[PDB]
Amino acid sequence: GHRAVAPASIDRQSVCVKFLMDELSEEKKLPVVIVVDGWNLFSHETHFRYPHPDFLRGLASFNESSTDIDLYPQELPRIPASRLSFVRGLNKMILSGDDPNKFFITCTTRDFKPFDGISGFPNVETDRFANSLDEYAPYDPEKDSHFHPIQIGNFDEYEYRSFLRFLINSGELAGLGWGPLWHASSDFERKLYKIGFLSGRNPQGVVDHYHQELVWRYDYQRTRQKQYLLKRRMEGMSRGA
Amino acid sequence: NTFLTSSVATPPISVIRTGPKWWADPERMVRQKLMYFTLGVDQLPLRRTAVIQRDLQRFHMCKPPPRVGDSTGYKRSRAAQLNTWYRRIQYQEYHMQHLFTRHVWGLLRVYPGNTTKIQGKADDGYVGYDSVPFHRYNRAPLPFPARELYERRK
Amino acid sequence: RLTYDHLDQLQQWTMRATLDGRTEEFNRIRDLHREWSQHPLMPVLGDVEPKFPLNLFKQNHRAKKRFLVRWHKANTPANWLWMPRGPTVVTPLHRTNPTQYPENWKQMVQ
Amino acid sequence: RRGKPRPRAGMFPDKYRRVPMLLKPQQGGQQYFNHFLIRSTNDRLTQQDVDN
């Protein structure tokens, strides 16, 4: 399928995907696990649109063909993902019974750009969402897929603690963290509590705020500790004297 | 890289003097850190910088400590020495940022802004589509279309 | 301008590189970093950057900036002597060569 | 300003004149005060046991 010089690869891959899926659906004894991340993208339209029919009919001049393709852009109906040959293969396995050989453990992605009822234009320097999708349309795994839905939340505190402890300490052990400067950042407990407040314990939020911790202004702990250790050392030096 | 046009270079010290406004703006510093971390390299100079600057910001509305006059001028010279230390700690950072950014852009098949070096790829400054038809600093004529630093497949 | 876009492209490059077992560019990057990230030395008393002399031009004059630029232009980072780069330099914080990094781990085994 | 030299910095009214004294610098970290107080007190007793 994939070992060819282009353009040949292009037609070869079509044939090859069709036959691959036709082969998969024909195997009834060997367990097969299909993992798709972001199934919810496969259950609605792709972002491609059917070519305007005038690309199919050939042309003499743009002058009079009765054709607008050069004048104005227009949207033609989106191509539904179910009409992708690959996704066709998979849907064929889901919908046909008499295939209890196959197990779809599959996932959803909410990675969409944010939209709250007004949108400006995103600043291109500061944009966390530039590689996010444009979707803005709701997805319900119950109605929109043939799979049994399982729900996942944010970390509870037991997860959250283990995870943060990892990110910080095993980060530092790998030479990726405060290192010799360790006395500048606060102690683990304080970081844990604060990053909890900031992140809401959402895992991506935890990762993100763990990095951002570099910039905290208003944390006073090490300051007051340092101060107390100092005072105690000087009382010790006055008692020795 | 979206910002392609010829630019004006500012001396490092004036860039650093922007403090919280740009050089130390939290937002910017964090994505520098992200770049380093992702490359699997400690960000020590960034952390030094962040420390110095964090504290700069905290005391930025206070008056400086009262000065007693000295023939020695030891105080004045010690304040100065500390200050130029910090300046240098930050020069090093500023250098690191420009360095790694150019290198990473070389890996990502990114074209830099006009008249910019990318060590392995464009030794003399890279240019394409400038307002001026020659390369500005070589004084050599520019080809059409814009010169390509990378082989074609994506 | 380093963008979140570039950070994502970076992540994907880094990943794809990890999975193809390409250790070389990681090593160039490690080298670069090791060289230029060393801790700069505390300056001797009496050492400061030159200011622009007063009573030369009026305070709103170009000459001021023209001086600053021309100074920093002359001190290139290859001329920074206050940061200790070289083969001579002992680097306690960092690993020395490729053989000490985790993807070599099989040779570290007894 | 105009064809005349700029005034020295001390000839302008205070830059932060409108910010209250409790804000420059902020005394934050109050949470810890009591803690260290107890701590130090405790330590004192420890340092008697050594002696006596």
């Binding site: 010799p180 006073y220 300051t223 101060q227 005072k231 | 030094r48 420390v51 110095i52 964090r54 504290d55 700069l56 005391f59 930025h60 206070c62 008056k63 400086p64 400590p65 304040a79 500390l82 910090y86 700690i89 | 801790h39 700069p40 030395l41 505390m42 300056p43 001797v44 009496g46 050492d47 950057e49 030159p50 021309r70 100074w71 232009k73 002359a74 001190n75 001329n79 920074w80 002597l81 206050w82 200790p84 | 610098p25 902020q26 005394q27 934050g28 970290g29």
Partner: peptide, 30 residues
């Protein structure tokens, strides 16, 4: 009154144990 955090600008933020640099490491220029 009690135990103020530093009341003054330009304090020592960052200290480390380092060697001294050479005298006049900066080239006079242009």
């Amino acid at each position: 009154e009690n135990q103020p955090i530093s009341l003054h600008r330009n304090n020592i933020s960052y200290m480390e144990d380092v060697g001294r640099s050479v005298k006049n490491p900066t080239v006079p220029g242009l």
